[PDB]
Amino acid sequence: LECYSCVQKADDGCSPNKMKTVKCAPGVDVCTEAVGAVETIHGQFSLAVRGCGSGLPGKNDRGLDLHGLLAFIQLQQCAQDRCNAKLNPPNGVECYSCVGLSREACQGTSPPVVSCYNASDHVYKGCFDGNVTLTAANVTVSLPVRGCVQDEFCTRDGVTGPGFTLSGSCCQGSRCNSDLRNKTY
């Protein structure tokens, strides 16, 4: 069985002119496509994996909420050839913002600064630092995530979906979220 094979890291890896067509190993019967879009109040980016899968055909969609960071995941598995291309005012606080940058850019005090605001009449006054991961086709993809959130006090909080996780920690004060990988409990 032939499937589209591509990986997207908030870039163009799954673009028309980067997509590969792969043939699957004996005993794998499905092609997979998994897109996880993560949304901050200043932007959105997507991880995506297309490749040979396992398991049964099906559709699995899930929306996640981590203190105001929204993630939306669509995971589709078919059984036909090349089928797996069917998806696609300031408040006081300032946060560092990573919304598509690599782990290279998104380090320390390097990322851009964003001005939080009370999106949808909810209060976004904490800063967040963590990462998003999406796993499918025996491949895993992750990027850092940074922005405003509604909680100033989370530590290694997370939400999970099918092959998908969004996790990190929160903090209080403007640009607190310089680097919270070491933050204790």
Epitope: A37, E39, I41, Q44, G63, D65, G68, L70, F72, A119, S120, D121, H122
Partner: antibody
Framework: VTLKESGPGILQPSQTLSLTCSFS??????????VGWIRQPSGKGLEWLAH???????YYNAALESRLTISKDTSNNQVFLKIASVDTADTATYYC??????????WGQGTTLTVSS | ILMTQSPAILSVSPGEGVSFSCWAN??????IHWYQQRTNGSPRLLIK???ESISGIPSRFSGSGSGTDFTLSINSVESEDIADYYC??????????FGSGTKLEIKR
Amino acid sequence: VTLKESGPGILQPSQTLSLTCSFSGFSLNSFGTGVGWIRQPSGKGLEWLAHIWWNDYKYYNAALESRLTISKDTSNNQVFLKIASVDTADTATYYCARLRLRYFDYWGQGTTLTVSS
Amino acid sequence: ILMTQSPAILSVSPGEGVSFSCWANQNIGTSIHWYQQRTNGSPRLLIKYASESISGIPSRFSGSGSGTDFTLSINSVESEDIADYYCQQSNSWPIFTFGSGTKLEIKR
């Protein structure tokens, strides 16, 4: 901020219900905004059916995810719901309401649908 | 997540301090909202996140609770507070669920 539902009023069983929500005083481009559809059979409770978000993501009541498709045209300020294969159980008042992230702050007056032949 | 309202019917005299219960089978934090539907009228958002008041709502409507049990209270019932009251949970966002409703009746 207002929402106005419109619909066909009466349908026979098996037909497709097409509902339009025309809204003003806000935008479906704002992060966290969403528009949902809720119905109430007369004398009975409210049931959430579906909601569509600013970023085009759609959620459905799983008991009706096979019958439901929700969509939007942001340019005209409209959200649509169509429910295929109507039955007598789809006799209800259907409301559109705006989703501020987690709750329905603004609702329309509702459009009443009778399914009968 | 299961949501049970109680009572279903709540017969009350004008001027009393009334309370509506909404119970979750599970812990839902503060993810509960309260709606008023007067007869022949649209649902109207009353209470946000358990206890946050909505602008343009009379001050007699207040809510409370966290975790499993949640309550809506009217400090002084007026004649136009005869209505159905619905809770909705947001604990399983983007999946929303409503209660069965509490119908406020007048005693006589």
